[PDB]
Amino acid sequence: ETVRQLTAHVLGLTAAADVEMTRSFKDLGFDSLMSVELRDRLCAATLLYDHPSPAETAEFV
Amino acid sequence: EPIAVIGLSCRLPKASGPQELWQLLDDGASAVTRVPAWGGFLDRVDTFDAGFFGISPREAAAMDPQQRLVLELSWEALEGAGLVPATLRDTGLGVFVGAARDDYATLYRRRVDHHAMTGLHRSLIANRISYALGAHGPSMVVDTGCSSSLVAVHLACESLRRGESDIALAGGVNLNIAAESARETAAFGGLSPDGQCFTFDARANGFVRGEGGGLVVLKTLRRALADGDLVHGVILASAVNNDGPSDTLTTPSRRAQESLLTRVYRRAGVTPTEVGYVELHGTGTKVGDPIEAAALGAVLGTGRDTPLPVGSIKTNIGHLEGAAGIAGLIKALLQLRRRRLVPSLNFSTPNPDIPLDALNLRVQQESAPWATTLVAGVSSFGMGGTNCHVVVSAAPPWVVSARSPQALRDQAGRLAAWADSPAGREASPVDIGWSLATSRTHFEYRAVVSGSDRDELVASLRALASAARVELPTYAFQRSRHWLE
Amino acid sequence: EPIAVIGLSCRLPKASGPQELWQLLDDGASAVTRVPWGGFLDRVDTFDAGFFGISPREAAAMDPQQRLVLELSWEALEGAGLVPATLRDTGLGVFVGAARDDYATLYRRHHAMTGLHRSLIANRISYALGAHGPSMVVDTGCSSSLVAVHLACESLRRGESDIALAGGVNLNIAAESARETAAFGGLSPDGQCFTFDARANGFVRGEGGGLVVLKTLRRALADGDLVHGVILASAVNNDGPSDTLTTPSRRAQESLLTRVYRRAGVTPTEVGYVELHGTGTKVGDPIEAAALGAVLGTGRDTPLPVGSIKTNIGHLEGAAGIAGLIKALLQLRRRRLVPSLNFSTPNPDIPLDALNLRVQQESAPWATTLVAGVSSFGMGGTNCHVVVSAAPPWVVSARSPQALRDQAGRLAAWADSPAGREASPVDIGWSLATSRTHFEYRAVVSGSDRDELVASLRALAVDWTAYFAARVELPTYAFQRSRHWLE
Numbered sequence A: 001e002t003v004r005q006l007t008a009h010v011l012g013l014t015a016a017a018d019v020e021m022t023r024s025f026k027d028l029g030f031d032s033l034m035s036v037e038l039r040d041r042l043c044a045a046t047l048l049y050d051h052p053s054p055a056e057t058a059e060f061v
Numbered sequence B: 001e002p003i004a005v006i007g008l009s010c011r012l013p014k015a016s017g018p019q020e021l022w023q024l025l026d027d028g029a030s031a032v033t034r035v036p037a038w039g040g041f042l043d044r045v046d047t048f049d050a051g052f053f054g055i056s057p058r059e060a061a062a063m064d065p066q067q068r069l070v071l072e073l074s075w076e077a078l079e080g081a082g083l084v085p086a087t088l089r090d091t092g093l094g095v096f097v098g099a100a101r102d103d104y105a106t107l108y109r110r111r112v113d114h115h116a117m118t119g120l121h122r123s124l125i126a127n128r129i130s131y132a133l134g135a136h137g138p139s140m141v142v143d144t145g146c147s148s149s150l151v152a153v154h155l156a157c158e159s160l161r162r163g164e165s166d167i168a169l170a171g172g173v174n175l176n177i178a179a180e181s182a183r184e185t186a187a188f189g190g191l192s193p194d195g196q197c198f199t200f201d202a203r204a205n206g207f208v209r210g211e212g213g214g215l216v217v218l219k220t221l222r223r224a225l226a227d228g229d230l231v232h233g234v235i236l237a238s239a240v241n242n243d244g245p246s247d248t249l250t251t252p253s254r255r256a257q258e259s260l261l262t263r264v265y266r267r268a269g270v271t272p273t274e275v276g277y278v279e280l281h282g283t284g285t286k287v288g289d290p291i292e293a294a295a296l297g298a299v300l301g302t303g304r305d306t307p308l309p310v311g312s313i314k315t316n317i318g319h320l321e322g323a324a325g326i327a328g329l330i331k332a333l334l335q336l337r338r339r340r341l342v343p344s345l346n347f348s349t350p351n352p353d354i355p356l357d358a359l360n361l362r363v364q365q366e367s368a369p370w371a372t373t374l375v376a377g378v379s380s381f382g383m384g385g386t387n388c389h390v391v392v393s394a395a396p397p398w399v400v401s402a403r404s405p406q407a408l409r410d411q412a413g414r415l416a417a418w419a420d421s422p423a424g425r426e427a428s429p430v431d432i433g434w435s436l437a438t439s440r441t442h443f444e445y446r447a448v449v450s451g452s453d454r455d456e457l458v459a460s461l462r463a464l465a466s467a468a469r470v471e472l473p474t475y476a477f478q479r480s481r482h483w484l485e
Numbered sequence C: 001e002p003i004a005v006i007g008l009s010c011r012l013p014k015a016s017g018p019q020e021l022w023q024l025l026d027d028g029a030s031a032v033t034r035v036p037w038g039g040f041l042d043r044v045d046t047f048d049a050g051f052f053g054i055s056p057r058e059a060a061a062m063d064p065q066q067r068l069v070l071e072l073s074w075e076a077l078e079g080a081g082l083v084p085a086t087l088r089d090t091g092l093g094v095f096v097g098a099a100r101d102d103y104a105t106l107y108r109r110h111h112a113m114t115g116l117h118r119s120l121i122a123n124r125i126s127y128a129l130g131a132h133g134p135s136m137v138v139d140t141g142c143s144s145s146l147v148a149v150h151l152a153c154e155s156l157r158r159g160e161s162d163i164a165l166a167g168g169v170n171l172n173i174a175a176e177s178a179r180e181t182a183a184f185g186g187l188s189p190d191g192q193c194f195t196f197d198a199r200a201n202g203f204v205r206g207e208g209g210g211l212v213v214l215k216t217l218r219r220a221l222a223d224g225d226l227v228h229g230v231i232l233a234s235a236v237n238n239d240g241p242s243d244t245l246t247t248p249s250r251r252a253q254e255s256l257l258t259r260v261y262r263r264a265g266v267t268p269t270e271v272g273y274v275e276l277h278g279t280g281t282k283v284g285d286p287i288e289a290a291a292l293g294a295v296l297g298t299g300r301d302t303p304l305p306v307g308s309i310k311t312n313i314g315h316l317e318g319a320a321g322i323a324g325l326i327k328a329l330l331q332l333r334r335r336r337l338v339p340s341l342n343f344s345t346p347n348p349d350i351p352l353d354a355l356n357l358r359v360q361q362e363s364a365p366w367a368t369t370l371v372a373g374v375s376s377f378g379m380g381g382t383n384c385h386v387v388v389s390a391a392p393p394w395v396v397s398a399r400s401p402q403a404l405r406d407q408a409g410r411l412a413a414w415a416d417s418p419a420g421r422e423a424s425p426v427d428i429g430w431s432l433a434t435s436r437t438h439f440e441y442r443a444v445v446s447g448s449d450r451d452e453l454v455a456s457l458r459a460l461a462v463d464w465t466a467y468f469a470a471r472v473e474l475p476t477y478a479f480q481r482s483r484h485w486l487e
């Protein structure tokens, strides 16, 4: 669909249901490597630096 | 310059807090049991509350449990000292942690992501505390041996005296996870088959395995008095030396210990016949115990009208071999605060090689009150030859906050239990409220209770769980299993 | 209270001593080669166990890092003009920073536990020298050596130590460590360290060690020792609340530099060189350059020369700080600046012109005293900076006839070298008689000219104190290493 937050499982929170929106990536845990990986994981569907929460990240798509 | 000790935290077998440790020591109970599928082992070493520190579960899985344990101990120590961690950001706070085991790395390597490098190095043990607390002071890990914790404490005291650090965190940690460490230790043949530490006893055959951690907050006495902090103790002087030219590298030397004791008592302004207790480093071995006894008798036993009381904490929890010094310092501080001397187990017949009557020393095997200030000494001798000694003297509506609802109810229940405990009955409810409102950080979730009596407040706290400064029962974490797979 | 450095020793790829290191640096060569990518030593399984009275089985179970540290300490003591036999029962402190224990991993694929402890790396020295000073091993990361040096200096200032041995070591023997390093994503694919360059894509692995001798400047002057340098101040701090636990911070480095140049009393625009900690990465290099420009770049009428030794031997991560300190001391002694390799164009993220910095890519004489700074940033976020200024018949002995002939050969070769031509033969004899210890097997040569003495030395390759002068350096000792590896 539009949100399809199924690639967040890279954070290790079991199924992609425990991941919460309207948050900050630095609080839940996101370094440069995970940020780059998540940016490159959206090829199958600024954009992340200025969009901490996954909600604004999915707002682009 | 004296150093003011204002707060401490510890995690030991059968002792999850200073109150539990005091109860265990005063009751004469031994925590050395069998391996949970001999030695003192902690409970659920694989459980950690990664959400509190903002660490992803994937990172925590490869994280060294020692680092998480030290982080929890530091948080507990800063909470119990009445200092808000949020006020320690952008400050020159020093961290001194002494560790000498990395068995988690061996377990990972015997049988590859980017977290392995960050989670399997000894420096990150203190670097994570520095990152979490935002400390601008020096942070490093010293590898000394059995006296690493005391070396770290001495380094913290020296740094405070120099003036480059205003608040220091000193202590140690050790965990026995891999059986490889046990196999190499048994290869040396220094383990007593009886599984007990017979310190200063004729049945001494070696030491027993032990694990745990401890941390303490060190500040200058002048600054502590200026800030009005509650002082647990006063460290007078410390020194670190090496045996040097002994018969064997493993074999300790009496002359070095004598010189260290003389020099540490010379600069501390402490004369014989006024030291009420000395913490022994003896691990129930028939080699170093007579040497330590002879050194103590030559230094402190000479020219004393009454025998010097001595004892060790390794008879209860075992030789932690990475945190023995900090454990002994914590025990001495607790004894000074309570003005009582806990008994020492495993002492029935005096060692024939140790002339206790001639050395004017006696092993404390009975709980007795402490009377005169009171001065105590903690000694830690490393296996390689490093020796350290620390001299400590005695000091001259309720709001509950947590980051989770279950955590909030657990905090409320623990606070109610502590209030119902006789330890918390010596403080007025106004003092408890002031400590909760000023000495505790405010989290996302909070609850407020009110009443006209302590019993009513406790009842309300239990129902929802379904000005002087006083201590509080630290923080209740929500630990979750995090292990490699 | 300034500290006096009166001697140093090092073991680096293609550099077995200070003279070899200076020759390699001045010639602008690189020791980074292929795996027999990164700087490597000739052999690491060779040791002279008979010199230290160590059993062959113990040497086989011995950690090679311990043996290398012991040899480096012995070499530093021999080159410092102090007789080790007179250092027994003295307050001599040892501070060695190590962060690698791959030998334990090799063993885990009674002597085993003694040869696999990181603390003993220092403690064994206290056993060998019979010293009563503190002996601890500090684990900090990439700045362990500088932290140990600062701790030794502070201990000397306090007064609990008389002579200190400060340094570090790092050896890469296990392929597992290389595997984790590659998985982390920091190894340069090209196998080169481009410091402050536009091609920066990581660092290169390197193995080696270093040690220096630290003494009180007043006490050294009273004794009359040969002062190699004067350390003025040293500070250790942490980055605290940075963006990432691995990512360094610029404000912390700026504050550390400010405090270390204010405590030492060295104002800007009089520092002639700065030893960079650049790892050839486009992340920390801009931060370090910005910090240097904000602290030292401002208020300077000339560009500040900067350079890093990692362009010659690669990153060591256990002895980088001591290697940089040794390089700075050598530059101060020779009053010359060695060029920096792997530098073609400035990094776009690094405004060298705006930051008032320039990379020393040529061999030029050093002119004004001369002040240098050495920086070391740890992986966890610990930063250290050290400020160092410049100082204001022949008898041969050995424990074996082969060792005696080897020592005679090296001494004759050093005498034939232009470095040894600046010392009179009487001074050489006095240094051999007083600054060297008489071993079991000793020989005495006689001659009326330097050429005759050299020829006699090659041919064969008593209170001598009252026989004779100043103190001059000698080519240390000729070891007879033997293979000792676990099976």
Ligand SMILES: *CC(=O)NCCNC(=O)CCNC(=O)[C@H](O)C(C)(C)COP(*)(=O)O
Residues within 6 Å of the ligand: A031, A032, A033, C141, C142, C185, C186, C244, C246, C247, C248, C279, C281, C283, C284, C285, C317, C377, C378, C379, C380
């Ligand atoms: C000895 C030592 O510490 N060596 C590494 C020094 N490294 C640096 O100065 C650069 C730090 N690099 C990074 O943090 C990388 O960018 C990471 C690890 C890939 C994270 O990148 P992200 O923060 O963009």
